[PDB]
Design a protein around this ligand. Structure first.
Ligand code: HEM
Ligand code: HEM
Ligand SMILES: Cc1cc(N)nc(CCCCCCCc2cc(C)cc(N)n2)c1
Ligand SMILES: Cc1cc(N)nc(CCCCCCCc2cc(C)cc(N)n2)c1
Ligand SMILES: C[C@H](O)[C@H](O)[C@H]1CNc2nc(N)[nH]c(=O)c2N1
Ligand SMILES: C[C@H](O)[C@H](O)[C@H]1CNc2nc(N)[nH]c(=O)c2N1
Ligand SMILES: [Zn+2]
Lengths: 411, 407
């Protein structure tokens, strides 16, 4: 079977065969497309197939498919699963696995970078204090004084699902949000609930607009524990505008390191419930979403007032104008301080080259158009006009429920 | 099997039950999503008719009535005897309005019940088609106070006698390839212009030449007709602060009017059914002007603005884009030609969508098309989950007729 995708700007047509390896489901059927829906313990029985499929992939990639080493490794994992009910990945398999979960991440525009990923193996970790130390080292390595380096840290896999490692933070670095009695919000409205949990667990909140949240770390299924990331490890950029001198007085700043900590990494049927990973920002994640979503810092109106735009009618495009200026400011600021950042033109162009390369060398590149297209200026980026096919390959990153909904409190 | 959609900005959650009445296929499977692919006998006809007339009689609250049973029997006898049937005027009007209502890619559906339907089923020649189309254009244009309309030519019979408008829109600009190797005019219309030239059109060879209509009646060879120039309302494009903008020599036409789609009602196929509304600004300012494969003017505008075009990260493309879109809205407004901006249009669509969930149990919507091509996430549709599925009556794509027509 061959599926074809067209680029409507270039008329370039690509042929996908890779979708023949998809397994998980999309959410869609022949009768309903769920392409814009945000959220669409295993037995021995299901596990060996999942292991075998992964190991066949790994051994093929190293050009040892069907070798003695390959056969011995299948046998060894088979027996391990039979007597212990799970198995342990070799370091090389873990590295390959983590890289491939990124490569397979259909919502990620940054995948040209997938093969450069520093993998920190934290499977010897046993306590929350151990987790903290691992996470500080990740943050310090990844930050690299502004010259950002992609990295992932992987904590022990799930066993009975009663002993899970979890980072309760959605990202390693994020700002607190506090709902005020008057119904307004100080800081980041997205993190209000998590901030209440931190406070309830005994965090002493500074109660400012940009308070870096503490880490809340669960090891081996125990109750989570609080830790403050050392401030000197948290690189931040004050936001200023190249021509507008009043922009700095809005008091805005952001952190340099985007680091997702709430996802589940699946490799060969194993589940790594704590696997924080980080890269560097595309400017629109801060300038469009973090700053301009109505449910976030929501600064559009204030910016447009200061620019003296005509705000009496939407048709003056005042919002569009302020939006662009805010995004110029974010890129200017990061660049001026030498903190790695990529604009949405550069990132989507690199993504299309990556995608074409993948079709040629791998036979496809699953991609989720809804997420890949940037949240401003969509159609003047080359991804807008590119047809894409979304399907699920393993290894993969998956959503998991927030741990405060599922955690069995010990006390 | 009953589905929830959430808005991630407002936390409003709606339940879709309408999708259970969905009929055609999406292109998607449980293994692969094709959400971003642009194009993913008496026996068959009676169920299609019944399904339609049932929904019709339900809508006027006469479901199961004698008049309902009588029409069903009437239509059944007509199909068995004639191999087809004819819609009552009321059914035709209901069906055309519902095809718009069901158009999952249309942001402007709050307006769906205000559609003037022109019944041209009595039309027999290409000359007749031309007269009907001029009247549509004039009625819909209304000197700039635009009114939604559709004109419906006779339905398909044996498929050898199709009515077709060969143009993709009633009003579009010609495209010509130059000795230079560049393109003069609209690059999207190069092929269609060639056919027009080939059929005899005398091309002016300008940058904004309104194409002639190429009209096919009763499966005959199509004929050329020029729309009276005084019926084509055009708008010169200027900017409220940039004095130099008018010197780019840009204009666009006021009436967006799709002419290449097929309207299916109760199994009957209307292969020529031009329909028109009014523009959302970004259709002209982002797509028509700024697509690389269309008028592609970003670079010229950026240069006149004197932006740093050395690096993508100065966001010069984005700045010039916004300015071009301001100019479009400004020019249409100054000349009192109806236009809607993408903020106002998407806000209306969210209100429409809540009405439809409340009153109909859902609203099929294709997010990839609903979200405007600029400033996506500052419009409320970006944060709105949508379910895409196909309901009839419907507008459908059909093959370009020159690939199909036996000459
Ligand atoms: C190298 C720099 C990177 C850039 C510029 C980048 C870019 C992005 C962007 C813009 C998004 C969408 C975020 C949003 O709009 O909310 C995203 C999503 C994602 N990326 Fe990346 N990415 C990078 C590195 C990585 C790395 C290192 C990984 C994992 C190893 C990764 C895995 C993911 C995943 C799983 C998603 C989807 C998240 C979700 O569904 O919530 N990315 N990427
Ligand atoms: C009244 C003002 C209207 C507005 C503002 C509007 C808005 C739009 C927009 C922005 C698109 C996407 C266009 C593109 O990106 O190429 C669209 C698509 C569409 N609209 Fe509307 N619309 C209007 C009236 C109508 C009417 C009167 C009908 C039918 C009677 C209609 C049926 C459709 C269909 C079938 C599509 C998708 C066309 C395709 O798939 O090629 N619209 N609409
Ligand atoms: C409801 C919901 C579901 C979901 N899957 N994801 C979200 C939040 C989306 C935020 C993604 C975080 C940033 C992604 C990212 C990750 C990395 C590693 C680098 C970079 N530049 N950007 C919400
Ligand atoms: C290959 C292909 C398939 C397809 N379905 N559509 C296209 C392009 C779509 C052209 C859309 C025409 C304009 C839409 C429109 C129509 C109306 C009636 C009003 C308004 N404001 N805008 C290409
Ligand atoms: C409903 C819709 O799917 C949702 O708002 C999505 C749309 N596209 C997105 N795209 C990216 N990159 N990030 C997001 O958070 C979203 N949100
Ligand atoms: C590949 C992608 O589906 C295609 O370029 C679409 C994207 N969204 C669109 N949305 C609208 N309204 N109109 C279009 O022409 C397109 N093009
Ligand atoms: Zn789908």
């Amino acid at each position: 079977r061959f599926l074809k995708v067209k680029n409507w700007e270039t008329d370039v047509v690509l042929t996908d065969t890779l979708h023949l390896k998809s397994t998980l489901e999309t959410g869609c059927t022949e009768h309903i497309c769920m392409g814009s829906i945000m959220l669409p313990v295993r037995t021995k029985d299901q596990l060996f197939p999942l292991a075998k499929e992964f190991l066949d992939q790994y051994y093929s990639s190293i050009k040892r498919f069907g070798s003695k080493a390959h056969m011995d490794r299948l046998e060894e994992v088979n027996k391990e699963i039979e007597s212990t009910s799970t198995y342990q990945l070799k370091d090389t398999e873990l590295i390959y696995g983590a890289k491939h979960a990124w490569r397979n991440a259909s919502r990620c525009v940054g995948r040209i970078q997938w093969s450069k990923l520093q993998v920190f193996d934290a499977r010897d970790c046993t306590t929350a204090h151990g987790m903290f130390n691992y996470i500080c080292n990740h943050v310090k390595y990844a930050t690299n004084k502004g010259n950002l380096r992609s990295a992932i840290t992987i904590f022990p896999q799930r066993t009975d699902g009663k002993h899970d490692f979890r980072v309760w933070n959605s990202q390693l670095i994020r700002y607190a949000g506090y709902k005020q009695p008057d119904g307004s919000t100080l800081g980041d409205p997205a993190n209000v609930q998590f901030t209440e949990i931190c406070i309830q667990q005994g965090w002493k909140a500074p109660r400012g607009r940009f308070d870096v949240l503490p880490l809340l770390l669960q090891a081996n299924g125990n109750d989570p524990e609080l830790f403050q990331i050392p401030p000197e490890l948290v690189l931040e950029v004050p936001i200023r505008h190249p021509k507008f001198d009043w922009f700095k007085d809005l008091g805005l700043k952001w952190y340099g390191l985007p680091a997702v900590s709430n996802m589940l990494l699946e490799i060969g049927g194993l589940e790594f419930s704590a696997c924080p990973f980080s890269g560097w920002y595309m400017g629109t994640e801060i300038g469009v979403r973090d700053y301009c979503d109505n449910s976030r810092y929501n600064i559009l109106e204030e910016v447009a007032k200061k620019m003296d735009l005509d705000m009496r009618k939407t048709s003056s495009l005042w919002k569009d104008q302020a939006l662009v200026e805010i995004n110029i400011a974010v890129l200017y600021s990061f660049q001026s301080d030498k903190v790695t950042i990529v604009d949405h033109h550069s990132a989507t162009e690199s993504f299309i080259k990556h995608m074409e390369n993948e079709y040629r060398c791998r036979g496809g590149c699953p991609a989720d158009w809804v997420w890949i297209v940037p949240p401003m200026s969509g159609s003047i980026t080359p991804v807008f006009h590119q047809e894409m096919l979304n399907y699920r390959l393993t290894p993969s990153f998956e959503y998991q429920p927030d741990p405060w909904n599922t955690h069995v409190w010990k006390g």
